[PDB]
Amino acid sequence: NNKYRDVEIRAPRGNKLTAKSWLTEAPLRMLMNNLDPQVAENPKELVVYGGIGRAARNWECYDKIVETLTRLEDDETLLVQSGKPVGVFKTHSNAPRVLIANSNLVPHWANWEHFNELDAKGLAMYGQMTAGSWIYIGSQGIVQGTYETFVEAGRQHYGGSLKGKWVLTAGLGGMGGAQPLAATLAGACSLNIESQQSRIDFRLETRYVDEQATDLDDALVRIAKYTAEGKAISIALHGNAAEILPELVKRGVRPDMVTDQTSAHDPLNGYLPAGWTWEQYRDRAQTEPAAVVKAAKQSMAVHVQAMLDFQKQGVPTFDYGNNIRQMAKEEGVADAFDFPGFVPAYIRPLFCRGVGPFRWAALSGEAEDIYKTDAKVKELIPDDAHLHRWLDMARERISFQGLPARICWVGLGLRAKLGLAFNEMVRSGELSAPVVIGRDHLDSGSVSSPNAETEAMRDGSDAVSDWPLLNALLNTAGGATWVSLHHGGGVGMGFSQHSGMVIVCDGTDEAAERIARVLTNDPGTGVMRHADAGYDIAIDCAKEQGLDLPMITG
Amino acid sequence: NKYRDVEIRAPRGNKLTAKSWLTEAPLRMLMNNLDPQVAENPKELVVYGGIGRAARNWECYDKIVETLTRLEDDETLLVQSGKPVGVFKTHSNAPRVLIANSNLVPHWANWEHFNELDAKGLAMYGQMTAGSWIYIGSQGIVQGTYETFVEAGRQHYGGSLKGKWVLTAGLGGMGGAQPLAATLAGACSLNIESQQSRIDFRLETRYVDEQATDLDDALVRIAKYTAEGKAISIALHGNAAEILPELVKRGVRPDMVTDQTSAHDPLNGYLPAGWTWEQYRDRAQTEPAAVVKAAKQSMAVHVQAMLDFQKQGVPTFDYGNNIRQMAKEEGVADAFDFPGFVPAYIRPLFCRGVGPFRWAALSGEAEDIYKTDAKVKELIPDDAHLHRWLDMARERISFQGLPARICWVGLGLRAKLGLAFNEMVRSGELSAPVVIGRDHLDSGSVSSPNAETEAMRDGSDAVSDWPLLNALLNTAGGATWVSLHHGGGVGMGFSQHSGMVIVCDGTDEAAERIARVLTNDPGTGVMRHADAGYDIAIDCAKEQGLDLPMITG
Ligand SMILES: NC(=O)c1ccc[n+]([C@@H]2O[C@H](COP(=O)([O-])OP(=O)(O)OC[C@H]3O[C@@H](n4cnc5c(N)ncnc54)[C@H](O)[C@@H]3O)[C@@H](O)[C@H]2O)c1
Ligand SMILES: NC(=O)c1ccc[n+]([C@@H]2O[C@H](COP(=O)([O-])OP(=O)(O)OC[C@H]3O[C@@H](n4cnc5c(N)ncnc54)[C@H](O)[C@@H]3O)[C@@H](O)[C@H]2O)c1
Ligand SMILES: O=C(O)/C=C/c1c[nH]cn1
Ligand SMILES: O=C(O)/C=C/c1c[nH]cn1
């Protein structure tokens, strides 16, 4: 192993290569970017986000991945198995250069206890979604999704804009840290409970949260003031959600929306029991992990009961993909699922058109490369004012972390248009170096997760996981530059299966042929999957886009 | 939509109905999987292994055939639990079909949830080769069953098994290979089977030799034949959960004990003690939970008899039908006191990438397989065990559907063979293309802690990254169709595994694909066993020049 190394890693910048080609330089740079101190939550331990989501299994494996990517030939493919470079095989230049499979366990053994047994033997690594597949871009990766969720909740419950309203939530980790800024962009104030001061500080440093209250009473004074003024200000409060949310219910405080984004998906590592310190928690997880898991899950039950109590008061309440309802249910809160997941409640119609967390990064390191792509997106999508406003807010309010990157939700049809245009900007020298195009594994065709993205599918097919497997096979066949299959991202061991893809735009004609089919097929599989489930909006999209769906179009 | 009173057989000869041999091949192998001489119950789409099906339902079957017929050379069909769900543009060196069957998010990966989805029209059990169109009747498993009995004989009895007998049960599609495998290894065998129609199928296909009239008759025949050193297989109509405890009580001592009933699926594949098959199938529809319970309670009695034979010193092993797990769930706490066949006997073969490599003649002509048998002997001139295998196959294995051959070979020889076969197609020595495939039971394509990855030396039994990487790499290298299945062999919850088939159509493009795919597919198994730290696998990797960064640098 070892899993601690006191080094600062950053992606190399500019146009000169360390690896043999841009197709192998790209995953090299994106692996290193996943560990950049401005990007990752705890990169000296290889941790990117999401509990113990890691970029490589241990530091020996990291070193060997870098060494191997550096020498990999253009007709060779590296296999990464739970963060370990296990084999290099001959393929061809239009296949992926890296195939990644992280954290997959045969289902009867797919649980944290067995994962932790394997980890102790040096046999495991949790990939999360984008940690082990090298496409994490800091809090920006999720911020548009969290904004779209808050906007749609506002449209359903409050007439759209959240001006004068406030969101109550918890968790200011890598992904959770997007919540305050997303709320602000949606027009709302927010109170964001976080148990570690260093995480509040990271969100302040990256300008994802605005201020820190001195205590709960002071936080409520600020929320009362800013909402009365119609300001949209995010407030962090250092504390424990499982103590504060029940206290807020006892006080009859009524937020306008309630959710949670603590790392409840991993009770041993990601969720602080009430009354404990993070330091006690980390230490006791090593001596008495069973007792720590039970204490964490008991506090999750208290926390979810508070969420249910807000909901009974008429407050819009939803689960944001961290499996907390499941944990509470296992601890006796039999009605934990009385509030819905964010996807069936708010986001699923976007997935039905293949819209999701499409993203790209400038391997050059140059901010202006992303600003030039933003301008190109506006030229190619001239009549979508919501999207133009998103890109304006991103430019004005999202500061880059590590390599400049952009989140921009778009769906089937436009993803390929954008990717081909970016490839041509690389060819012409408008862009100073190639760019990579990817996405979260949360996307319309790439995830099965019955307590998150596939909760409450109208046909009952929540648990069917053929679809992400087919998505990864098809990305490999079409020519993505690296393809990944992961288990347990988001919701934890046992609860999801999902796929990732990244494709490099290096300005070549060969890349253009791959891009045209890969960025059609990847969102196409999500429209297909939702059309199969019988969503009329997905069937309409399939017809509009000319998809060939034999059981539907013949 | 579930039942169709039709006989289906693969098209023969050289005329295509699809646009190329790469799309004609999956069309013919899908049909071959349903041939009445191949499949256990093809009018309900069932190929083998409980309810392992070739397509979800008959509408889906028809649409797969229609879609394969029109598929272009740069298009790929996606099959999702036996349903043709999308056609997408790829390129001519990608697979024409990508298949994912029966995959369920792990917390829901169980038969109860499968059956809920099935009742909604949302599910199909792919087994291993049922849903991925490379089943060749009982021949697909017979050499692995033979290699298991041979290695058990080497470990326990000095090799040959002449004078010895095996006790087992299950004469279904794959269990039907057990009698002939025992015979070829030199042993007599007693094979318990609950359905006379299954005994008849094995008799007609020459996989079992005789049927005893009752248990006493069976034992008189075993005593006589073993005393004479004959290797004869005996079927007995009955219930193993009744007969095995009776043999323990009688003090009968077989020389090996195993089982291959469909214990992996209590609702459909395992008859409770005292029930008729009709009663079981009727009640399965009326009271499924009570049927599951009764089946599992009988599996517990069955497994306790196996444990009781082992206590008497009888070599006893689990042959991958998950029966130990079912018995443990019913209270047999020491059900895993006897091992699975792979850690006990077969794993050293997997460490060299050796496994159930196979091919089929799309022409339909037996002589095409005889020509390939002769070519294998020429290419592998100094392996007399393999030559004897092919001689025994010729003599004793009858073809079922398209003529096909099982021939266990590993890393290095698979590619030599497939390139030679492709050259035979190109020269016209073979009268039509051949398909080359394998079971999903193979060194790099399955994670199954109660079967192929039981008791890995490093404790990595449940790691299922490996079959997913195998499928991704076969897709990258250009197999003709690639599959990812869940629950083959051992049932929902207990395995994940990959399949591949590649067509040898005589062309230079196929040759390029074949050379890397038939290197990489067994290469991933040698890699996986090398990663676990098996010195035999590390040696193989070095011999074969594999690039394993954490071992070779
Ligand atoms: N459905 C989705 O789309 C989706 C998307 C992204 C992330 N996720 C999930 O979101 C969750 C957060 O991800 P992340 O990257 O921010 O994780 P992280 O591990 O980086 O951060 C979790 C934060 O929760 C805080 N925390 C834990 N227990 C607390 C408690 N009791 N009170 C207050 N704070 C507490 C921790 O101090 C930490 O800062 C994870 O469960 C992740 O898997 C789900
Ligand atoms: N370990 C391996 O390498 C391996 C390989 C292949 C298949 N399998 C498993 O082998 C098993 C058999 O496969 P198959 O294709 O023969 O299945 P099948 O469903 O075609 O046949 C099962 C047979 O078991 C018989 N049977 C059921 N209960 C019985 C009982 N109590 N007494 C006697 N007979 C009984 C049935 O009548 C049937 O003929 C399945 O569990 C399959 O998944 C394991
Ligand atoms: O946007 C990202 O990079 C990460 C997201 C993710 C989704 N679910 C768990 N992690
Ligand atoms: O040899 C075959 O075609 C099928 C086999 C298989 C292995 N395990 C479950 N099915």
PDB file of N, CA and C in Angstrom, chain A residues 18 81 139:
ATOM      1  N   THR A  18       3.954  14.100 -21.303  1.00  0.00           N
ATOM      2  CA  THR A  18       4.739  13.143 -20.519  1.00  0.00           C
ATOM      3  C   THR A  18       4.465  11.728 -21.054  1.00  0.00           C
ATOM      4  N   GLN A  81      -8.347  -2.310 -11.858  1.00  0.00           N
ATOM      5  CA  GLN A  81      -9.284  -3.151 -11.076  1.00  0.00           C
ATOM      6  C   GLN A  81      -9.252  -2.607  -9.645  1.00  0.00           C
ATOM      7  N   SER A 139     -16.411  20.813  -6.642  1.00  0.00           N
ATOM      8  CA  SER A 139     -17.832  20.890  -6.345  1.00  0.00           C
ATOM      9  C   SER A 139     -18.646  21.258  -7.590  1.00  0.00           C
TER      10      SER A 139
END
